[PDB]
């Protein structure tokens, strides 16, 4: 995952916070060092091959410093609630074919011009109610979408029982309608899923979607049979696949830019981000100006990531160690 830079950006994983240079013993330790005059801030840390210090931040030449929680960096998956249009008919009219076109927009390619469509179809019956429609619609959608031998999963299908109204009933291709026994179904939730991820090589990306409806002949009138509204999101993609890509890039500004290229003839870098753990990010953005005529700024930033467990314990202690050393006023998340 290549990112943009204002100028060079360095990341330091804060796996443990110490109080001296001498206490740095394990890979992932950190200590914010400063003066007693508070004119220079740097971060001594323990690399996987020894102690390494960061750049020296002039505390007069800081632009901003802000700390971002984990839930700010968690992607909310988009949900769409597919119902029958009550103006058209609240019950399925008999003998009509109910086709639904899910329009994917950023399928495999990177643009909106690379598009993809998955269909679901139900021909309504004489005694088919609304819940028996949503049952057969979601069985037909999951049969087309969530086959096992697809290339990537696209969306998740969930019925909702009107008695429950807050618990998602998962519908897959292996699901039969013998398993779906509830008689009060009021919507079909279609919700996007998390794509695969390889660190550095495949970034975190999502394929957005919209459900679209073909018209039915209701009373001699070609009316589109349903409406699709976007309900509030109830799931989040965690921060871990985003920070490990943020470390894989920012370990070439310190380390090797040739990552893997002539394969046995490489330096291999040890990365201290566990991709299955959430992190909080602190961005100290600062600059350098020269003596007399070298007044152009070299605006750069030093990133710090700390793993946090619910309440942000390790980041608020990191900020509290920076604020007493630097004299800064970084706000605590």
């Amino acid at each position: 995952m290549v990112i943009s830079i204002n100028q060079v950006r360095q990341l330091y994983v804060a796996k443990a916070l110490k109080a001296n240079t001498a206490a740095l013993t394990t890979a992932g330790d950190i200590v914010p060092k400063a003066d007693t005059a508070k004119t220079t801030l740097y971060f001594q840390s323990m690399s996987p091959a020894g102690i390494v210090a960061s750049d020296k931040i002039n505390l007069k030449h800081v632009l901003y410093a802000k700390a971002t929680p984990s839930e700010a960096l968690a992607h909310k998956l988009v949900r769409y609630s597919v119902t029958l249009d009550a103006d058209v008919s609240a019950t399925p009219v008999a003998g009509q074919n109910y086709i639904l076109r899910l329009a994917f927009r950023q399928y495999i390619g990177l643009s909106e011009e690379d598009q993809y469509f998955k269909y679901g179809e139900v021909i309504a019956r004489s005694g088919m109610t609304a819940s028996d429609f949503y049952k057969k619609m979601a069985i037909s959608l999951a049969k087309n979408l969530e086959n096992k031998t697809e290339s990537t999963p696209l969306v998740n299908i969930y019925l909702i029982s009107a008695a429950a109204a807050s618990t998602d009933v998962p519908v897959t291709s292996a699901t039969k309608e013998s398993d779906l026994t509830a008689t009060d179904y009021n919507q079909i939730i279609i919700e996007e899923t998390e794509q695969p991820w390889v660190l550095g090589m495949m970034p975190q990306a999502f394929i957005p979607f919209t459900p679209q409806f073909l018209t039915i002949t209701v009373d001699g009138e070609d009316r589109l049979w349903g409406v699709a509204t976007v309900v509030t999101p109830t799931k989040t993609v965690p921060d871990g696949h985003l920070i490990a890509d943020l470390e894989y890039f920012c370990m070439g500004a310190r380390g090797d830019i040739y990552r893997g290229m002539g394969y046995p003839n490489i330096i291999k870098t040890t990365y201290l981000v566990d991709p299955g753990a959430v992190y909080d990010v602190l961005d100290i953005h600062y600059f350098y100006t020269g003596s007399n005529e070298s007044v152009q700024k070299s605006e750069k930033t030093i990133t710090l990531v700390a793993v946090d467990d619910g309440s942000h314990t390790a980041m608020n202690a990191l900020i509290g160690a920076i604020n007493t050393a630097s004299g800064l006023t970084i706000a605590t998340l």
Partner: protein
């Protein structure tokens, strides 16, 4: 909507685009059923 151009006199049922005429009852095929006119 659906135009019918024939009327068929048969005891059996005709094709669905035709009017079923049998002895005094008229029928026509609508919504998957032969619908009695009367």
């Amino acid at each position: 909507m659906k135009t019918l151009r024939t009327l068929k006199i048969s005891p059996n049922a005709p094709d669905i685009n035709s009017v079923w005429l049998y002895k005094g009852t008229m029928k026509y095929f609508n919504n998957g059923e032969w619908e009695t006119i009367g």
